[PDB]
């Protein structure tokens, strides 16, 4: 089966889909949190007295 038939014959639909994917990845990049590692340190709470 040729699952690509429509796109092969109408390449601008393929272009548009890829640009949309690309564009939404670009929008998303500066929204992503950024750190060296994922959150792996167990949460902790410190009680201090003197």
């Amino acid at each position: 089966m040729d699952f690509s038939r429509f796109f092969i014959d109408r390449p601008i639909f393929a272009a548009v889909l890829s640009i949309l994917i690309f564009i939404t990845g670009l929008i998303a990049i500066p929204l992503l949190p950024v750190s060296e590692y994922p959150d792996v340190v167990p949460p902790s709470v410190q009680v201090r007295a003197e």
Partner: protein
């Protein structure tokens, strides 16, 4: 007004005093204009849908270039009647550009 008041305070206040915005002014002063990203993204997405519809990279411009004229017609009505471009007018502009 905010820039002017910032200027005033540099001229007027003694060393050791300053101003801080609060309430809605603080939001105005600390918000970016994401409109600079939102508007080009909207135009480009609409262009891409039309490029697919028409199978043409150029025919979408026959639609897109027309919409500034509808916005000008509406804003001309506001200007003529002495209105302003408040948020309700602004949504109306965009719906009229949609139609």
């Amino acid at each position: 007004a905010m820039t002017h008041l910032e200027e005033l305070s540099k001229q007027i206040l003694p060393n050791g005093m300053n101003i801080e915005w609060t309430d809605l002014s603080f939001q105005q002063a600390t918000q970016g204009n994401t409109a600079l990203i939102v508007f080009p993204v909207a135009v480009l997405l609409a262009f891409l849908v039309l490029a697919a519809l028409y199978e043409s990279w150029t025919l979408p411009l026959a639609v897109i270039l027309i919409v500034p004229m509808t916005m000008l017609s509406a804003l001309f009505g506001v200007w003529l009647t002495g209105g302003d471009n408040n948020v309700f007018v602004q949504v109306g502009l965009v719906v009229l550009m949609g139609l």
